[PDB]
Design a protein around this ligand. Structure first.
Ligand SMILES: *[C@@H]1O[C@H](CO)[C@@H](O[C@@H]2O[C@H](CO)[C@@H](O[C@H]3O[C@H](CO)[C@@H](O)[C@H](O)[C@@H]3O)[C@H](O)[C@H]2NC(C)=O)[C@H](O)[C@H]1NC(C)=O
Ligand SMILES: *[C@@H]1O[C@H](CO)[C@@H](O[C@@H]2O[C@H](CO)[C@@H](O[C@H]3O[C@H](CO)[C@@H](O)[C@H](O)[C@@H]3O)[C@H](O)[C@H]2NC(C)=O)[C@H](O)[C@H]1NC(C)=O
Ligand SMILES: *[C@@H]1O[C@H](CO)[C@@H](O[C@@H]2O[C@H](CO)[C@@H](O[C@H]3O[C@H](CO)[C@@H](O)[C@H](O)[C@@H]3O)[C@H](O)[C@H]2NC(C)=O)[C@H](O)[C@H]1NC(C)=O
Ligand SMILES: *[C@@H]1O[C@H](CO[C@@H]2O[C@@H](C)[C@@H](O)[C@@H](O)[C@@H]2O)[C@@H](O[C@@H]2O[C@H](CO)[C@@H](O)[C@H](O)[C@H]2NC(C)=O)[C@H](O)[C@H]1NC(C)=O
Ligand SMILES: *[C@@H]1O[C@H](CO)[C@@H](O[C@@H]2O[C@H](CO)[C@@H](O)[C@H](O)[C@H]2NC(C)=O)[C@H](O)[C@H]1NC(C)=O
Ligand SMILES: *[C@@H]1O[C@H](CO)[C@@H](O[C@@H]2O[C@H](CO)[C@@H](O)[C@H](O)[C@H]2NC(C)=O)[C@H](O)[C@H]1NC(C)=O
Ligand SMILES: *[C@@H]1O[C@H](CO)[C@@H](O[C@@H]2O[C@H](CO)[C@@H](O)[C@H](O)[C@H]2NC(C)=O)[C@H](O)[C@H]1NC(C)=O
Ligand SMILES: *[C@@H]1O[C@H](CO)[C@@H](O)[C@H](O)[C@H]1NC(C)=O
Ligand SMILES: *[C@@H]1O[C@H](CO)[C@@H](O)[C@H](O)[C@H]1NC(C)=O
Ligand SMILES: *[C@@H]1O[C@H](CO)[C@@H](O)[C@H](O)[C@H]1NC(C)=O
Ligand SMILES: *[C@@H]1O[C@H](CO)[C@@H](O)[C@H](O)[C@H]1NC(C)=O
Lengths: 315, 40, 240, 46
């Protein structure tokens, strides 16, 4: 849904602790401000992407203290109060399975904290299990959960009587399927590979951006103080500019890389916002849009820089 | 008497849905809502 | 429903006739495009390490030999200035194409149809949409049904009658607290629980939370008044 | 006749088959024709 926000001190990356290099960097005009307008246009939309996905709920819906769902046990996907952040049991698996300045580079915080993403997710989950799709299309109107599922069975072309007759089995199957979700997430490393790959990239890219400073670009040293101590002004500037030209291309390559990556993350946030609207706030007739089978309902789960949908289907 | 303030943002009004194993809410009326969406 | 629609289109004008900022998604595009051309014209003023930013100041001064070392600097810096602009525009064009492919899909599914996709064609139960053009863009007026004034009811998954369980054909069972009704799921309009409103399956021993109420069979009275029609025909016959 | 609808004769449908179609109305009236008949047979006495 999002990637890390970055901004960079173009003048500190290219020319950190050098008045001479800073006075030469003025020859390129707006070759640094544009870079900062590009990284800001990316950072502003990471907050947009997150909202588009999570903030689809008008009110912070809460679940009833008494869990009379008729058998369906959502305790593993509902908030757990005995925590500093009220994440669910499955959300605290997801947050563990993904593992996460002198160069003028810095990382900016997201506008919504992980607690606020968890509150939006809790409200979505609460409204879904207390009111069905009705909170997506008006005010949340309560309905009993088994009865709500009966409608969902009619939505897949199955007659409501079938659900009532197998209610307990249907409840058991669900409770057993949510049991397997945790085990899978607890045991298996590669399950969150999509979210770890975004973090790995954000890290490889910044690592490559910093490693470039050590490069000569054909200058006599990669250190501005060596060039400025050993050579006279009219010779030293050439070696300083040699680094500048190469550093400024090392920044322009990074910013371009982030822009291209940011378009992939936006397409994924726009898809995740569509799965939130169509699979969580509704029931979907679109084949393979909300998992394999006949989609019944979905539960959203927050993960580091992303979203998990637990899709429920009749097979 | 004006100033800049700084605050933790609210996520929305808090709502406790009146769920029970035998209660349903049914709308006795409707509104027609026209909403504008702008796309490049 | 018509007065609501006419009032909702009224507010649409009011809002657009009032606020300065409603088309912020389209102005942004104009602002981005302009800013990129104004930045590209500003690049021309840069020396890139040449003795001047102006070729006429170099040609008039340095002879061809001394000039080419300066002209090359200006060529090198400008070439990148153009490459930067064209890379920004190729990336930015893919943002606009993704939005044009979405707008073409909202035209097909919201205007040329009625969408069942949740929140695709506005916030509600989508009914229809009307397209309106804007500078380099489209505006969809999405008309939606929003349910407005709910009442709480008691409810049941089935009704039990002659030991048989009864479920709604379309609708849901509700009670006002004393009497039982079947109603459509999205608007309170109650009916007597009739065989024509319900279907049977199994008996009252398998459904969790089933309730006892009578299920009316409109055929009985029309046969029962016929019984009275038969009776009185036998009575009048008990005369000769 | 409650699960099904009628449209056209059989000849036109490729692969149509023969089976009876029950009418709940038939007996609901035939058990009323025995309610006619037993009331008539009683009336024979007086
Ligand atoms: C639940 O809905 C029931 C159906 O409308 C309703 O039953 C009806 O109640 C009215 C009175 O509330 C009865 O009307 C009788 O009494 C009024 C007032 O004196 C007069 O018009 C006549 O005396 C009339 O007979 C209806 O006959 C009665 N209908 C049925 C189906 O029995 C219940 O009262 C409602 N219960 C609630 C409010 O929870
Ligand atoms: C809903 O309808 C049910 C079906 O009639 C009814 O169950 C019936 O309950 C009565 C009252 O207890 C029983 O009558 C007697 O039989 C039981 C054993 O079954 C004995 O303990 C006593 O002698 C009792 O008086 C009926 O036998 C029983 N019928 C069956 C077959 O279940 C429910 O009570 C009804 N519920 C409501 C809403 O009142
Ligand atoms: C399914 O039902 C069909 C309609 O009742 C039935 O067709 C009937 O077949 C019998 C037996 O062949 C015919 O009886 C005789 O009449 C035909 C001319 O119509 C003559 O060729 C022979 O004398 C024949 O024995 C019925 O006339 C005919 N009815 C109609 C309306 O065509 C099918 O046979 C049934 N199929 C099966 C597998 O039982
Ligand atoms: C729907 O029901 C809730 C709660 O259940 C009701 O509680 C009683 C007030 C009574 O209506 C019972 O038949 C129901 O079991 C209602 O919430 C109540 O709201 C009122 C104010 O309107 C407040 O004074 C009560 O304390 C609330 N009760 C509880 C238990 O929270 C709610 O108003 C009902 N909604 C509609 C549309 O009628
Ligand atoms: C609903 O699921 C929860 C687990 O999410 C069940 O709680 C477990 O109950 C067993 C049996 O008492 C305990 O051994 C576990 O330690 C509990 N786990 C947790 C995390 O609470 C609960 O029993 C289930 N309830 C139903 C309806 O069966
Ligand atoms: C239909 O499939 C369900 C499983 O989806 C079967 O239910 C299981 O039945 C066995 C005994 O045969 C129990 O031990 C299991 O606990 C049941 N499942 C669950 C999850 O509770 C059911 O038996 C099948 N019905 C038929 C006719 O084969
Ligand atoms: C159902 O809602 C409609 C509005 O959607 C209500 O109609 C309005 O009624 C008021 C008077 O009470 C009029 O002034 C308005 O002009 C009506 N609306 C429109 C847009 O014309 C209606 O009264 C509601 N019905 C109930 C029973 O509450
Ligand atoms: C609903 O829950 C109550 C306890 O809160 C219980 O006594 C009752 O039997 C339940 N009814 C249904 C529909 O199962
Ligand atoms: C008896 O029924 C006959 C019709 O069979 C009718 O013509 C006659 O008026 C009736 N008379 C009485 C007294 O009911
Ligand atoms: C079906 O196939 C059989 C041969 O296996 C053939 O005799 C029969 O006419 C076919 N019927 C239809 C409905 O095509
Ligand atoms: C016959 O009809 C009389 C009324 O005319 C009734 O009292 C009696 O019970 C009936 N007997 C039978 C055999 O149904």
């Amino acid at each position: 849904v999002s990637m890390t926000k970055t901004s960079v001190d173009c003048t500190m990356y290219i020319c950190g602790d050098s008045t001479e290099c800073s006075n030469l960097l003025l020859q390129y005009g707006s070759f640094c401000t544009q870079l900062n307008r590009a990284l800001t246009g990316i950072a502003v939309e990471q907050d947009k992407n997150t909202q588009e996905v999570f903030a689809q709920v008008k009110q912070i819906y809460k679940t009833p203290p008494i869990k009379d769902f008729g058998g369906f046990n959502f305790s593993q996907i509902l908030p757990d109060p005995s925590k500093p952040s009220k994440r669910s049991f499955i959300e605290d698996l997801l947050f563990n399975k993904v593992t996460l300045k002198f160069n003028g580079l810095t990382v900016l915080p997201p506008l919504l904290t992980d607690e606020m993403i968890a509150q939006y997710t809790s409200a979505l989950l609460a409204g879904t299990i207390t009111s069905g799709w009705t909170f997506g299309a008006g005010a949340a109107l309560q309905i009993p959960f088994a009865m709500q599922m009966a409608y969902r069975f009619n939505g897949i072309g199955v007659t409501q009587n079938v659900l009532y007759e197998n209610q307990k089995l249907i409840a058991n199957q669900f409770n057993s399927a949510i049991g397997k979700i945790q085990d899978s997430l607890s045991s298996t490393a590669s399950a969150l590979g999509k979210l770890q790959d975004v973090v790995n990239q954000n890290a490889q890219a910044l690592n490559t951006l910093v490693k470039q400073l050590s490069s000569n670009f054909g200058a006599i040293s990669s250190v501005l103080n060596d060039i400025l101590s050993r050579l006279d002004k009219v010779e030293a500037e050439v070696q300083i500019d040699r680094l500048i030209t190469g550093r400024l291309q090392s920044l322009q390559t990074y910013v371009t890389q982030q822009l291209i990556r940011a378009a992939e993350i936006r397409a994924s946030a726009n898809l995740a916002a569509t799965k939130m609207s169509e699979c969580v706030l509704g029931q979907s007739k679109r084949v393979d849009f909300c998992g394999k089978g006949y989609h019944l309902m979905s539960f959203p789960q927050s993960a580091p820089h992303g979203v998990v949908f637990l899709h429920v289907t009749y097979v | 008497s004006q100033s800049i303030i700084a605050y933790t943002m609210s996520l929305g009004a808090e709502n406790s849905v009146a769920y029970s194993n035998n209660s349903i809410a049914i709308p006795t009326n409707f509104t027609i809502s026209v909403t504008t969406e702008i796309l490049p | 429903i018509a007065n609501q629609f006419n009032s909702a289109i009224g507010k649409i004008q009011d809002s657009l006739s009032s606020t300065a900022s409603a088309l912020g998604k389209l102005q942004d595009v104009v602002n981005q495009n302009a800013q990129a051309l104004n930045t590209l014209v500003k690049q021309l003023s840069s020396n890139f390490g040449a003795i001047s930013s102006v070729l006429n100041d170099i040609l008039s001064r340095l002879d061809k030999v001394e000039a080419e070392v300066q002209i090359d600097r200006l060529i090198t810096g400008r070439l990148q200035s153009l490459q930067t602009y064209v890379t920004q525009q190729l990336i930015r064009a893919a943002e606009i194409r993704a939005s044009a492919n979405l707008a073409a899909t909202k035209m097909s599914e919201c205007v040329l149809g009625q969408s069942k996709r949740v929140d695709f064609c506005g916030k509600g139960y989508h009914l229809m949409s009307f397209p309106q053009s804007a500078p380099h863009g489209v505006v969809f007026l999405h008309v939606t049904y929003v349910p407005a004034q709910e009442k709480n009811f008691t409810t049941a998954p089935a009704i039990c009658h002659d030991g048989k369980a009864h479920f709604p054909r379309e609708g849901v069972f509700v009670s006002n607290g004393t009497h039982w009704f079947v109603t459509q799921r999205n608007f309170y309009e109650p009916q007597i629980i009739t065989t024509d409103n319900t279907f049977v399956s199994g008996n009252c021993d398998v459904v969790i939370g089933i309730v006892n109420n009578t299920v009316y069979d409109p055929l009985q009275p029309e046969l029962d008044s016929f019984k009275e029609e038969l009776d009185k025909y036998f009575k009048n016959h008990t005369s000769p």
